[PDB]
Amino acid sequence: QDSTQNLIPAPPLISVPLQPGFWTERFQGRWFVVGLAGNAVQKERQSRFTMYSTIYELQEDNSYNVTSILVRGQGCRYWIRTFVPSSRPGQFTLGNIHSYPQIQSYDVQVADTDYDQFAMVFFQKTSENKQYFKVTLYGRTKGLSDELKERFVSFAKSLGLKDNNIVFSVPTDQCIDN
């Protein structure tokens, strides 16, 4: 990090469509990263990025306790946070973002999410006039066909980004397989 001090074609939430049949519970469970795009993506040359699980678990008031998994220190560790439906279900903000110091706005849009099929998401993080934005490829398991992955890189370009900021899900050698 701290090198990409330049923002690419930074699209607002409003550039990205919503799942036309969005339901709280159809966005609950473990989703694996099967691809990643974005100017805030650490796309060095190969793939500095590595897949993790965004595990959105519903609470009483559709605040998701999302279990992110990271290789922290010299081992594996889950970092769990809250994802809450923003102004509309589909736009995702943080259950605890709302005390942000620098965060201009945080809203993610899932273009398509399914119970068996895969999910493509646009993530918008703004901070200090600097927009950090990426397009993700999430899968219902460690076994999502290359077909849907190529579709994400294509969606990556739809926001105005380039392959040079799009990496492919590295099979992490560490905890993540939930």
Q: What is the CATH number of the domain that holds 161?
A: 2.40.128.20
Amino acid at 120: M
PDB experimental method: NMR
Rg (CA), the chain: 15
Structural domain count of the chain: 1
> Is 53 annotated as belonging to a binding site?
yes
Residue 50 CB contacts under 8 Å (≥ 6 apart), including other chains: 71, 169, 170, 172
> Is 78 annotated as belonging to a binding site?
no
Residue with tokens 């849009």: 109
Collapsing DSSP states into helix, strand and coil, what is residue 122? strand
* Spatial distance between the Cα atoms of 178 and 55, rounded to a whole number of angstroms: 9
Closest by CA to 95, choosing from 74, 134, 68, 120, is 68
- Residue 80 buriedness (CB in 10 A; 0-12 / 13-18 / 19+): exposed
> Is 142 annotated as belonging to a binding site?
no
Q: What is the extent of the structural domain holding 79? A: 1-178
Collapsing DSSP states into helix, strand and coil, what is residue 160? coil
Residue with tokens 């901070």: 127
> Is 54 annotated as belonging to a binding site?
yes
Rounded to whole angstroms, what are the CA distances from 178 to 29, 68, 119, 136, 151?
Answer: 10, 11, 18, 19, 25
* Spatial distance between the Cα atoms of 45 and 110, rounded to a whole number of angstroms: 27
Rounded to whole angstroms, what are the CA distances from 82 to 52, 65, 140, 173?
Answer: 16, 5, 20, 26
> Is 43 annotated as belonging to a binding site?
no
Residue 55 CB contacts under 8 Å (≥ 6 apart), including other chains: 29, 30, 31, 66, 67, 68, 69, 178
Closest by CA to 118, choosing from 91, 96, 137, 133, is 137
> Is 106 annotated as belonging to a binding site?
yes
- Residue 17 buriedness (CB in 10 A; 0-12 / 13-18 / 19+): middle
> Is 4 annotated as belonging to a binding site?
no
